[PDB]
């Protein structure tokens, strides 16, 4: 097998590689998370001959986890599957479910032993993983190629991230939390920076995952106009 | 060994004889037979003493590193399972072991049954060792949910008492603790024959 | 040794992958190979790059190959390399068949071969294999469909699609005729040799197949000549029947 | 330069310049001595601190009752090397009930660090060690480098300003045999010191001692350890 | 292009040379040893006020003894704290008690230079990491310094970061040997304030200390808040 | 077919006290019906404040003593301190239990100083499973002499009778005395008797004689 | 023993221009019956079944893995499996596990999709082939099998002379094995079609 | 060893070893294969630089079982390779199957095999095409095999030098229900147009494939055939 | 020991277990629950050895759950049960043979109602009714007494009351109380736990 050092450290003191997938996320689609206090929500920027459900970049990891991804999506795919065996593989290890850390720790692991280990270049993308936790408190978390992790209210990543990032600072507000309506509104605000090219999910305190379509999306969209 | 414990109103009551026993002879008088893991966690351990002392300290060892590495003390659900999971991979391997993983946790007051075989039983009340059966007799008969907090340790007290009166392979001093909201208390290590002398006077 | 690596599983400075890219320029200039999907049905139609009067014939297919009996696939790239890829993927498909009883939905065996495809990009120093594959299929959970993959390992869904030579003009060519959810395989198969007319017209250099379910079970069959060349005269036909009006 | 970066890659010179370069790993590392008697091994150490603040690096190490260390190059190597020594001496007293003989423990070092020297991807040791010990055949000092040669010794120095340490030495050879321990640690001293400038000096933070022989197992001498040693000629 | 394993003229490893050079990008911490306790202090560096302050766990338990503090790539360090409070917990199994400051920082700098190409299994770089360890154990309070070399040194104060030159200067005239605790504490916040181009406020910094008596605690909103004063 | 184990016998026994520690044994080694050797002390001296005694087969003592003795080491290498008698009796259980399926057929019982400067008893099983006494007995005699040790050391089933603690001349005595009862009525105990006493001030060795048949 | 804890009964037999091949549908463990309808005879192309008596479990994953095997073969040869060869891929998928086997005794029965002459064999546990020109049985009632069959066999028998044959060869020996039976299933292979059906057999 | 592919894409998107590895199939010593009506032909040119050769030792028409035979233009080391490989895959499906393998299914497999030297870590592919006659249903089979690893069935073609001047003799000069007979003598006809030299029954080569198998014609055979030239 | 039953119906599958859990002579639990949702319509009852059948149920529950995650849709009641035997029939011949006894009853939308049957050899076969237990040999004859294939529901668990009461009067082990459920189209359906 291949152990040739595929990550080192340059003149400078930097990892060349895990800096060139980062790279590789702000071309990427422009994915954008957002936190409440009873639901958590997720969005992402967009051919006309295409299946949307294909090309979906939100992704259910377990039952009250999910996550949205920036960058390549071959190398997403990878990240989804080990994070979906680890989150069954920890029900059968200590039978109660994965609290939202935990798996941001694993994919954060997992992202950064590619950026150490022979042989592995590292993954390009950066993630945004939501949901509620044992005692149900919501959490959204961010990973990057280099492995580290921050909880965030609300973030972006992908093309022209510091614009809509610069939006949220000013806009996330406790006004815009408040109402389960109010919430997914701010996202597509965020997205209509950068931007039917909007895919949009939601995860409410005790129910699954539910992604929106494009006519429930277009209702929001006559709700913003007004303001 | 006999080892017990029961949940009631004010927590859980978790009690255990203390006799080893290399055939006949009497091995050791004196074995503390529960280990304290953390403030809000006990095990119970009966069977082979060094299966028993080995792979409850092991689970103690990664409850311990459950709370350096996540910033929060384990679950009851998560240690009984864990040590269940130590019993599959060593399964068919001739371990002896019968414990009752005790606790508090967000979930409430939590006993589990761990055994060598993999079972994993979540129960109100259960009983080890070989004195399981007279344990059961006692606990059982004068069992409530509401009980008192000395009246629990009436019941617990009594039940390892009567089980080393039957049983060969029990005896010693009674070890019992006490589970709350604000983690574990030792009540007493009562000695057993003193207290089957103290009733006996009572007829 | 250090020296001698090539490193094809590695990020350029720009933030992407060379070796992945190259490929896909190899792409670009084998034949043209297309899929578009209907409501009773999908088909596969390619550019037949094996043109020689001394050529034998020997095989159903030339580009086409099938996977599982609800299942068939065409490629665009170094042949050699999709007989692996196709030997894998018929693999895959027993394995599941194996395991559950049930044959392999069709997202499920693009995803696990293009998995493996991704891993050639990420890690074992190995260059990527050098094939962008057009699947058709049938399954209980979303019927007829129609996927294509690229030597990155990554996948999409399409309503109609097209890879190999003149890629792009096709593509736009077919996102003007196509209409969603009204297409009949009769109609579909008037638009692929529409669109091949543009790109590359005897039959010879053309190979279809369609891929339908009746009564029950899916058939899958490859034309034969009669049948291409009678629907090559209707389109020199239709062509010169709007060119006198 | 096309010969520099891997150990396999011979130079038309006829030389190895990632040995040559290990070391260098020596040669920039700090300073130390050691020497023997008839009854006596002894190391000295002049240990480098980081800042003022900061306390002072430990520079001698302990690898049985019978031998002992100290070091000059790069710590992780340093502290590998150490821990092949202890086992080696472990595996000894294991297996024989006897310690291991000292050229012994010495030619297996050797062994050890010249393979990395000949196989592609690998580096030499960057650490040299001076080596105290006693056994059956009296005390011995022996040095060992990156290269993978060991040399046995009367005595030596290695590190920073070690060539003024190596010609002191060299005119009191006959001398050491002769002495006795404390005037045999004072020689070693007074070696060490020639490294320094004469603006600095020896305290008792910034040296260490390290004596082994017949009567005495290898101990270590630090602090308020050291101060019986310093305390009978200081000038120049 | 060369080795990962492949000696400078100078004698010295160029990716540890150039994991010395991360340190230097990194955000500065700062530790200083007393009698009376180890405190331990560290700028958390926050990009964005979307950001959750609390999640960036700069200075973390090790054990109920041992705290230590970060500086240079955070998720290089991961690796190596997990290991540790794998160590420390090994050590309790096996031998039912404590380790030494001394003995986790040696376990950890073990670990330093185990890497290279071929003969692996294994990681292809070192960690782009300095660790300032500081606890208490039976030889009194005790920190430790670590760097990507795997060298490792007892410190009555050092600092690591972008500014551990400026900071180390700092510390040189601030430090005496016979201080209290609760001196230097405020000692750190000082010294840590004038470095970061932020302004320094309770949700802009960690502090953490280790006693002989408490066990290692981290400082709060209204703990950091008392003490923001000088 | 090939026994792995053989029983060599011999006692071992130990003792804490407020200030010191006992730890005795025979000498007798034994094969079947033959004396192997009649100096073959089970003690084995550790550290300056901890001494372990031995018994069982002899080519697993041989070799666990050896262990130790290697352990010891390799820790004061690691943490530049010599192990805590706690420590050492800690270290044994995982060694014992690392044997589980193939044991070291020897039963331990280490004795010394803990770091609080008092008597400290650690007993042992084959697989590892110990706890800390005040006293006990092991290997051949051990069913002779620990309920005589439980009866005047553990002042049992006695009435009227205060409970004052082991003087280090008393306890010397008593073991004295019972392992002469020992020798009488156990083949594989006899020949002589090793005490090593364990105080602060360091380790001493007498050999009081046995009988000899 | 190993082969009668589930038990069951497979017989194929030859006719002029045709192949038979039946089963009992009795799945059991030991004395308890637990279902009448259990799948014994499996299709291997149009006109190419193998039956599978013995242990249930490895009647099952026998079944499974030559099929795994057969749509491999087919897909890459681009043509329907000869009976000949379908007994080479079972004889080498058995003995491979030669030292730990599957307990099923195949018996395969078909008509060569070329020429549309008759086939059948037997192998034992290990894959050793047994090729005749009459009949092959296997099942705890082999030896009741053989001594129906031996008597009843005629060469060159009409589609409907076969099935009366072998259907009579099977309820007749079934109905003297305590673990067979439960009903009896018969396919007449023949060019044009395939003729299933089941039996009006004894349900004790 | 070297666990990275030698064979890797350039920036126009070509396997850039398989294209000098045709080059030097294309510079080889050329060879022939015709499929008639009733059987399969292979010839090729063997003119070794001296007549110190013994023509008798080694062959470059060799058999592979008794059914299918093989022919090569290009490099003659890495062609016994696939000689030896191919032997091997024909027992692995005669063992496993009890029939004689698919001409088609041999090429298949040792298309597989020449793959894996274009990918496979520290190995160029081979420098060789091979033509591979045979006899499976009731009929003849001819396939090429070119370092790729892509395969393609003929009806006739050649290989190395004058491939190119051989393709074109052959596509107006076969006929696609030819005797056998007349397809050895088309063979011969399509060497001696590349040939430097008077042809002779040792200084070339011919094997032949029909209803009982495949075989390697001798030198009489041959000079038959030689004389009404 | 431990006693599992199963009902298909024509829309619907009928289920129950009882809930001892046992040990030596004593019975620790009266409230222990056999039964493990794969999906919302599949339920796994599961009987044997006391580690074996936790440990393998839940293997094959949380591959199901996995399942779903990765494709947006779950196994059906075929396919898990093929799935459940791959896995049994693997360990088979190999250093841990779980000896697990189970059924696997479940609703497809296509193909309707389906109960499993599967002994510790690997053996899958579905079935209108089946039992697990030493309480089979005694209740499998008043299935085939009683039931059609067109029973009703509410009819069913006055069939199931039949073979749970015949355990009370002629088993000799104890099983006072049973868990039931029910799945159909809505999936899986709690039911009043049969005590006495
Ligand atoms: B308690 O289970 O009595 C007790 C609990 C511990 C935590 C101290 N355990 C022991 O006393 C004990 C004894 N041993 C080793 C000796 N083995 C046996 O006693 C033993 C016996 O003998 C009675 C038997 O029966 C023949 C079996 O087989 C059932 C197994 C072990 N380890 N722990
Ligand atoms: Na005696
Ligand atoms: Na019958
Ligand atoms: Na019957």
């Not at chain 1, 997720?42 to 009250?64: H, M, S």
């Amino acid at each position: 097998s291949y152990d040739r050092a595929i990550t080192v450290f340059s003149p400078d003191g930097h990892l060349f590689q895990v800096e060139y997938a980062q790279e590789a996320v702000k071309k990427g689609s422009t994915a954008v998370g957002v936190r409440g206090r009873d639901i958590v929500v997720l969005g992402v920027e967009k051919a006309k001959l295409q299946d949307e459900r294909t090309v979906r970049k939100i992704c259910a990891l377990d039952d009250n986890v999910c996550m949205a991804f920036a960058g390549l999506t071959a190398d997403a795919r990878i990240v989804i599957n080990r994070a979906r065996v680890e989150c069954q593989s920890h029900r059968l290890t200590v039978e109660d479910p994965v609290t939202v850390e935990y798996i941001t720790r694993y994919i954060a692991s997992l992202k950064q032993r590619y950026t150490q280990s022979n042989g592995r270049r590292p993954f390009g993308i950066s993630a945004l993983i939501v949901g509620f936790d044992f005692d149900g408190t919501p959490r959204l978390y961010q990973t990057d190629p280099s492995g580290t992790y921050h909880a965030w209210k609300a973030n972006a990543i992908g093309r022209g991230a510091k614009s809509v990032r610069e939006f949220l600072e000013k806009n996330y507000t406790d006004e815009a939390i408040e109402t389960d309506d109010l919430t997914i509104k701010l996202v597509i605000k965020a997205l209509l920076e950068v931007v039917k090219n909007i895919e949009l999910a939601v995860m409410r305190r005790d129910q699954s995952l539910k992604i929106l379509n494009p006519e429930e999306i277009e209702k929001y969209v006559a709700e913003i106009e007004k303001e | 060994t006999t080892t017990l414990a029961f949940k009631f109103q004010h927590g859980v009551i978790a009690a255990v004889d203390s006799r080893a026993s290399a055939g006949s002879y009497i091995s050791a008088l004196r074995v503390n037979k529960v280990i304290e893991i953390n403030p809000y966690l006990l095990g119970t351990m009966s069977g082979c003493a060094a299966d028993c002392q080995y792979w409850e300290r092991l689970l103690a060892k990664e409850c311990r590193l459950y709370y350096l590495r996540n910033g929060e003390r384990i679950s009851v659900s998560a240690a009984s399972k864990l040590l269940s999971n130590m019993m599959c991979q060593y399964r068919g391997m001739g371990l002896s072991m019968g414990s009752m993983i005790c606790g508090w946790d967000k979930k409430g007051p939590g006993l589990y049954y761990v055994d060598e075989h993999g079972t994993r039983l979540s129960g109100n009340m259960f009983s080890t060792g070989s004195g399981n059966t007279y344990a059961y007799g006692v606990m059982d008969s004068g069992y409530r949910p509401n009980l008192s907090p000395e009246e629990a340790y009436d019941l617990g007290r009594r039940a390892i008492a009567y089980a080393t009166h039957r049983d060969s392979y029990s005896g010693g001093v009674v070890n019992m603790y006490h589970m709350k909201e604000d983690g574990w208390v030792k009540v007493e290590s009562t000695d057993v024959s003193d207290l089957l002398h103290q009733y006996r006077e009572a007829n | 040794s250090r020296r001698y690596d090539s490193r094809t599983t590695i990020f350029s400075p720009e933030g992407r992958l060379y070796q992945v890219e190259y490929a896909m320029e190899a792409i670009g200039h084998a034949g043209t190979c297309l899929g578009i999907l209907a409501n009773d049905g999908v088909l596969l139609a390619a550019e037949r790059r094996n043109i020689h009067k001394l050529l034998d014939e020997v095989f159903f297919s030339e580009k086409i190959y099938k996977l599982n009996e609800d299942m068939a696939c065409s490629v665009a790239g170094i042949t050699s390399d999709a007989n692996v890829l196709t030997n894998e993927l018929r693999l895959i498909a027993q394995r599941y068949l194996l395991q559950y009883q049930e044959p392999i939905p069709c997202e499920q065996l693009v995803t696990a071969l293009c998995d493996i495809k991704q891993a050639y990009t990420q890690f074992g120093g190995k260059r990527p294999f050098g094939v962008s594959l057009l699947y058709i299929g049938w399954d209980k959970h979303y019927g007829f469909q129609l996927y294509q993959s690229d030597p990155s390992g990554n996948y999409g869904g399409w309503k109609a699609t097209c890879i190999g030579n003149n890629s792009a003009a096709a593509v736009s060519m077919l996102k003007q005729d196509y209409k969603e959810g009204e297409m009949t395989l009769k109609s579909a198969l008037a638009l692929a040799i529409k669109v091949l007319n543009k790109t590359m017209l005897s039959a010879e250099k053309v190979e279809i197949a369609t891929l339908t379910r009746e009564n029950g079970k899916t058939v899958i069959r490859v034309l034969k000549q009669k049948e291409v060349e009678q629907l090559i005269k209707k389109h020199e036909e239709e062509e010169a029947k709007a060119e006198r009006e | 330069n096309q010969y520099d970066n891997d150990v396999t890659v011979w130079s038309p010179q006829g030389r190895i310049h990632q040995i040559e370069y290990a070391m260098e790993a020596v040669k920039q590392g700090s300073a130390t001595v050691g020497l023997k008697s008839k009854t006596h091994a002894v190391l000295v150490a002049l240990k480098r601190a980081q800042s003022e603040l900061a306390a002072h690096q430990k520079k001698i190490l302990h690898v049985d009752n019978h031998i002992g260390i100290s070091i000059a190059g790069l710590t992780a190597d340093a502290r590998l090397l150490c821990n092949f020594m202890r086992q080696e001496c472990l595996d000894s007293r294991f297996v024989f009930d006897r310690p291991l003989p000292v050229s012994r423990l010495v030619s297996l070092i050797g062994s050890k660090t010249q393979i990395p020297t000949q196989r592609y991807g690998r580096r030499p040791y960057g650490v040299g060690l001076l080596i105290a010990g006693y056994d059956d055949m009296g005390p011995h000092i022996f040095q060992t480098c990156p290269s993978a040669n060991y040399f046995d010794c009367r005595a030596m120095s290695i590190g920073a300003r070690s060539q003024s340490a190596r010609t002191y030495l060299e005119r009191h050879m006959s001398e050491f045999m002769e002495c006795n321990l404390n005037e045999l640690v004072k020689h070693g001293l007074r070696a060490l010191r020639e490294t320094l400038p004469a603006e600095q000096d020896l305290t008792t933070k910034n040296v260490s001692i390290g004596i082994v022989g017949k009567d005495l197992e290898f101990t270590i001498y630090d602090d308020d350890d050291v101060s019986p040693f310093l305390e009978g000629l200081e000038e120049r | 292009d060369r080795g990962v394993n492949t000696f400078s003229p100078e004698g010295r490893l160029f990716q540890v040379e150039y994991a010395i050079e991360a340190i230097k990008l990194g955000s500065t911490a700062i530790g200083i040893q007393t009698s009376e306790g180890v405190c331990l202090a560290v700028e958390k560096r926050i990009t964005s006020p979307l950001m959750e302050p609390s999640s960036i766990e700069k200075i973390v338990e090790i054990d109920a003894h041992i705290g230590c503090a970060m500086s240079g790539l955070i998720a290089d360090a991961k690796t190596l704290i997990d290991k540790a409070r794998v160590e420390t917990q090994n050590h309790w199994f096996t031998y039912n008690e404590t380790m030494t400051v001394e003995s986790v920082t040696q376990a950890v700098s073990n670990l330093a230079l185990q890497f290279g190409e071929e003969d692996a299994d294994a990681m292809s770089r070192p960690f782009g990491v300095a660790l300032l360890f500081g606890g208490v154990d039976e030889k009194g309070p005790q920190l430790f310094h670590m760097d990507p070399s795997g060298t490792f040194v007892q410190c009555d104060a050092r600092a690591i970061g972008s500014a551990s030159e400026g900071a180390q200067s700092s510390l040189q005239e601030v430090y005496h040997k016979s201080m209290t605790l609760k001196e230097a504490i405020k000692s750190s916040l000082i010294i840590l304030k004038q470095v970061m181009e932020e302004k320094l406020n309770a949700t802009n910094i960690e502090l953490a200390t280790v006693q002989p008596g408490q066990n290692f605690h981290m400082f709060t909103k209204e703990e950091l808040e008392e003490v923001i004063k000088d | 077919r090939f026994s792995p184990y053989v029983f060599n016998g011999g006692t071992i026994l130990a003792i804490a006290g407020e200030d010191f520690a006992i730890v005795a044994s025979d000498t007798r080694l034994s094969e079947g019906f033959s004396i192997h050797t009649r100096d073959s002390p089970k003690c084995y001296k550790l550290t300056d404040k901890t001494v372990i005694g031995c018994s069982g087969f002899h080519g697993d003592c041989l070799t666990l003593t050896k262990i130790i003795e290697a352990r010891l080491k390799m820790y004061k290498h690691s943490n530049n301190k010599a192990m805590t008698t706690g420590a050492i009796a800690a270290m044994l259980s995982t060694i014992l239990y690392s044997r589980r399926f193939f044991p070291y057929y020897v039963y331990n019982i280490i004795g010394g100083l803990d770091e609080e400067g008092k008597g400290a008893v650690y007993s042992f099983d084959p697989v590892g499973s110990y706890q800390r006494d005040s006293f006990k007995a092991g290997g051949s005699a051990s069913a002779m002499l620990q309920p005589l040790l439980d009866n005047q050391v553990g002042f049992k089933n006695m009435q009227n009778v205060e409970h004052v603690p082991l003087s280090l001349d008393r306890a010397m005595r008593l073991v004295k005395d019972v392992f002469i009862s020992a020798a009488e009525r156990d083949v594989y105990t006899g020949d002589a008797l090793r005490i090593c006493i364990v105080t602060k001030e360091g380790i001493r060795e007498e050999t009081v004689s046995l009988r000899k048949d | 023993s190993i082969m009668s804890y589930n038990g069951g009964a497979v017989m194929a037999m030859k006719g002029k221009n045709c192949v038979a091949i039946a089963a009992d549908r009795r799945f059991g463990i030991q004395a308890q019956m637990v279902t009448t309808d259990f799948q014994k005879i499996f299709p291997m192309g149009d006109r190419l079944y193998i039956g599978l008596a013995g242990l249930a479990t490895d009647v099952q994953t026998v079944a499974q893995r030559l099929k795994f095997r057969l749509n491999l073969y087919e897909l890459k040869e681009g043509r329907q499996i000869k009976p000949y060869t379908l007994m080479s891929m079972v004889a080498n998928l058995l003995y491979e596990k030669r030292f730990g086997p599957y307990y099923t005794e195949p018996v395969i029965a078909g008509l060569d999709p070329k020429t549309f002459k008759p086939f059948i064999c037997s192998l034992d546990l290990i894959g050793c082939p047994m090729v005749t020109d009459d009949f092959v049985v296997s099942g705890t009632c082999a030896e009741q099998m053989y001594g129906m069959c031996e008597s009843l066999w005629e060469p060159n028998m009409d589609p409907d002379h076969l099935f009366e044959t072998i259907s009579q060869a099977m309820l007749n020996a079934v109905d003297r094995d305590a673990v067979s039976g439960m009903g009896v299933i018969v396919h007449i292979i023949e060019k044009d079609k395939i003729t299933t059906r089941t039996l009006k057999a004894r349900m004790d | 060893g070297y666990s990275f592919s030698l064979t890797t894409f350039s920036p126009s998107g070509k396997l850039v070893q398989i294209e000098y590895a045709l080059a030097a199939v294309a510079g080889g010593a050329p060879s022939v294969g015709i499929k008639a009506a009733n059987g399969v032909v292979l010839a090729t040119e063997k003119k070794q630089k001296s007549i110190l050769y013994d023509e008798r030792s080694v062959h470059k028409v060799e058999p592979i079982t008794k059914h299918i035979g093989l022919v090569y233009s290009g490099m003659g080391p890495d062609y016994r390779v696939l000689v030896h490989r191919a032997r091997k895959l024909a027992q692995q499906y005669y063992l496993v199957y009890q029939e004689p393998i698919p001409t088609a299914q041999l090429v298949q497999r040792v298309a597989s095999v020449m793959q894996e030297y274009t990918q496979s870590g520290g190995v160029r592919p081979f420098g060789v095409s091979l033509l591979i006659c045979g006899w499976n249903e009731g009929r003849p089979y001819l396939f090429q095999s070119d370092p790729s690893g892509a395969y393609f069935a003929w009806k006739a073609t050649a290989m190395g030098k004058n491939y190119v001047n051989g393709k074109t003799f052959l596509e107006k000069r076969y006929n696609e229900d030819l005797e056998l007979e007349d397809a050895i003598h088309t063979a011969i006809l399509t060497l001696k147009e590349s040939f430097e030299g008077q042809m002779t029954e040792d200084n070339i080569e011919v094997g032949i494939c029909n209803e009982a198998g495949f075989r390697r014609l001798t030198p009489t055979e041959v000079k038959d055939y030689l004389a009404a030239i | 020991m431990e006693y599992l039953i199963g009902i298909q119906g024509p829309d619907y599958v009928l289920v129950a277990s009882d809930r001892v859990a046992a040990s030596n002579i004593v019975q620790m639990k009266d409230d222990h629950d056999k039964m493990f949702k794969m999906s919302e319509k599949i339920l796994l009852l599961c009987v044997g050895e006391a580690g074996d059948t936790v440990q393998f149920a839940e293997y094959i529950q949380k591959n199901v759950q996995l399942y779903k995650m990765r494709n947006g849709y779950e196994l059906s009641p075929t396919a898990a049960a093929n799935f459940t035997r791959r896995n049994l029939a693997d360990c088979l011949r190999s250093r841990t043979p779980y000896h697990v006894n189970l059924l696997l009853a479940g609703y497809d939308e296509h193909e309707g109602p389906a109960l499993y049957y599967m002994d510790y050899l690997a053996a899958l076969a579905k079935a209108p009714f089946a039992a697990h237990g030493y309480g089979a040999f005694l209740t499998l004859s008043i299935l085939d007494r009683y039931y059609t294939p067109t029973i009703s529901r509410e009819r069913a668990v006055e069939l199931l009351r039949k073979c749970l009461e015949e355990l009370q009067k002629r088993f000799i082990l104890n099983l006072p109380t049973f868990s039931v459920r029910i799945i159909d189209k809505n999936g899986i359906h709690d039911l009043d736990n049969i005590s006495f």
